[PDB]
Amino acid sequence: DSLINLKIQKENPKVVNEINIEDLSLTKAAYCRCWRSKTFPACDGSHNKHNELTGDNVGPLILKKKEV
Amino acid sequence: DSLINLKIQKENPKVVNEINIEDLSLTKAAYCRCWRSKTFPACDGSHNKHNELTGDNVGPLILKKKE
Ligand code: FES
């Protein structure tokens, strides 16, 4: 029964982020599911240190947008 | 120093899920960031029980199509 989010918007009772698909410009964009990214909601690779430290296996959600 | 993901795909060293945006069927789709959903990588509202149990404030990432 451990907290998952330690640092992000603790004054907020539920941190929910929205992505409007039409705004995604990159063919590939990674979003954080570990709550350790310094650019949250984006993934910055911080999951890797978390995984090494705790022995976890978390990773990001990758949103893929085909080239029109 | 504690685990975030307790039970999802433990045989996999790093769980990464790819979403093909062009194939979203719903205008609003919620994706799990708590690692408790029974429909992972989709959010099924399991974050609410996690938050109540632990006092946390995690919630989903929501993808929205153009209006
Ligand atoms: S930094 Fe959190 S999933 Fe990559």
Ligand code: FES
């Ligand atoms: S069930 Fe995990 S964020 Fe909703």
